[PDB]
Write an enzyme that holds these catalytic residues in place. Sequence first.
Site, PDB file in Angstrom:
ATOM      1  N   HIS A   2      45.902  29.278  43.386  1.00  0.00           N
ATOM      2  CA  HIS A   2      44.299  30.140  43.435  1.00  0.00           C
ATOM      3  C   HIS A   2      42.934  29.822  43.622  1.00  0.00           C
ATOM      4  O   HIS A   2      42.754  27.982  43.853  1.00  0.00           O
ATOM      5  CB  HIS A   2      44.073  30.564  41.610  1.00  0.00           C
ATOM      6  N   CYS A   5      41.886  36.136  46.247  1.00  0.00           N
ATOM      7  CA  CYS A   5      41.268  34.497  46.417  1.00  0.00           C
ATOM      8  C   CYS A   5      41.491  33.504  47.646  1.00  0.00           C
ATOM      9  O   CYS A   5      39.831  33.292  47.317  1.00  0.00           O
ATOM     10  CB  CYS A   5      41.847  34.162  45.360  1.00  0.00           C
ATOM     11  N   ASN A  23      35.033  31.563  39.992  1.00  0.00           N
ATOM     12  CA  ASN A  23      36.025  31.715  39.738  1.00  0.00           C
ATOM     13  C   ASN A  23      35.957  33.472  40.496  1.00  0.00           C
ATOM     14  O   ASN A  23      34.632  33.501  40.414  1.00  0.00           O
ATOM     15  CB  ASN A  23      36.977  32.506  38.552  1.00  0.00           C
TER      16      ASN A  23
HETATM   17  C1  LIG Z   1      45.636  33.615  44.812  1.00  0.00           C
HETATM   18  C2  LIG Z   1      45.272  35.032  43.780  1.00  0.00           C
HETATM   19  O1  LIG Z   1      44.409  35.654  44.484  1.00  0.00           O
HETATM   20  N1  LIG Z   1      45.573  35.068  42.752  1.00  0.00           N
HETATM   21  C3  LIG Z   1      45.670  35.782  42.146  1.00  0.00           C
HETATM   22  C4  LIG Z   1      44.641  36.301  41.648  1.00  0.00           C
HETATM   23  O2  LIG Z   1      44.427  36.970  40.372  1.00  0.00           O
HETATM   24  O3  LIG Z   1      43.178  35.625  41.036  1.00  0.00           O
HETATM   25  C5  LIG Z   1      46.875  35.271  40.517  1.00  0.00           C
HETATM   26  C6  LIG Z   1      48.559  35.718  41.291  1.00  0.00           C
HETATM   27  C7  LIG Z   1      46.596  33.536  40.425  1.00  0.00           C
HETATM   28  C8  LIG Z   1      46.221  33.281  38.591  1.00  0.00           C
HETATM   29  O4  LIG Z   1      47.198  34.840  45.776  1.00  0.00           O
HETATM   30  C9  LIG Z   1      46.026  34.314  46.428  1.00  0.00           C
HETATM   31  C10 LIG Z   1      46.406  33.113  47.350  1.00  0.00           C
HETATM   32  O5  LIG Z   1      45.711  33.501  48.373  1.00  0.00           O
HETATM   33  O6  LIG Z   1      46.883  31.848  46.817  1.00  0.00           O
HETATM   34  C11 LIG Z   1      47.298  31.186  47.277  1.00  0.00           C
HETATM   35  C12 LIG Z   1      45.949  29.783  47.375  1.00  0.00           C
END
Ligand SMILES: *[C@]1(C(=O)N[C@H](C(=O)O)[C@@H](C)CC)O[C@@H]1C(=O)OCC
Length: 251
Positions: A197, A29, A217
């Site tokens: 996120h 993300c 998103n």
């Molecule tokens: C952001 C991420 O991609 N998170 C996952 C997603 O599927 O979007 C989950 C764990 C969130 C519900 O680990 C990534 C990041 O860089 O987070 C720090 C901002």
Amino acid sequence: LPESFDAREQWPNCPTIKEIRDQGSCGSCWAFGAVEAISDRICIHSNVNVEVSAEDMLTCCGGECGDGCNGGFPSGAWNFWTKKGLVSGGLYNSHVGCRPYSIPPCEHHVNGSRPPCTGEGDTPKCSKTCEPGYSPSYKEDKHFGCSSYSVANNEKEIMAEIYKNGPVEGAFSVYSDFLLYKSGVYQHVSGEIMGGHAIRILGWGVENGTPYWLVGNSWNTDWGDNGFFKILRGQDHCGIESEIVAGMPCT
Ligand SMILES: *[C@]1(C(=O)N[C@H](C(=O)O)[C@@H](C)CC)O[C@@H]1C(=O)OCC
């Protein structure tokens, strides 16, 4: 500043602003929020339209941006754009641009025709080459940013930045009740912490007297409100105003 603002309506000649991508089964993300806003800004400040490669950001930035599919640092991503630049690259299997995304789309906390997303996904290799048939070369396809900065945890300053320069990248703490979002203005009330996120903030408004941020998103279009969602604005809710980052493209 106006009571409401939608970058999609304000910059009609920049279709990337309306796009919703799919990060797949990978914690990228941080990279998506960045390349999405960067794509928007390249169009806004160059009126050319470019689908900035999430793959290039995700795989080639390295430690400066964190740990690939294991999470990263938004400000680090914009730094990479100014230091090494980013090539073009569209959606998975699109064959669009130098480096299209290599991780398959999936169902993010919703039922659908795609396979369900799995938390386990490895960071793809950093290949400094373009897909076959694409021109110019990887090096020649790089688009550089000429500044990378962090916007203060200040509602008005954030609104002003978006208003003048376009969508920005932000991040917030995700609790399980957010996973089932469908409509309205999201406000956290229950659920275990899922982690940070990163997302793309492209506007704001007021719904039923509740101020909100318009957010894109990266969980495809069948999640939430066509891939978008609204979250409480003005109270640094879930830290939505605490990690805003952006930058400007080189001429
Ligand atoms: C952001 C991420 O991609 N998170 C996952 C997603 O599927 O979007 C989950 C764990 C969130 C519900 O680990 C990534 C990041 O860089 O987070 C720090 C901002």
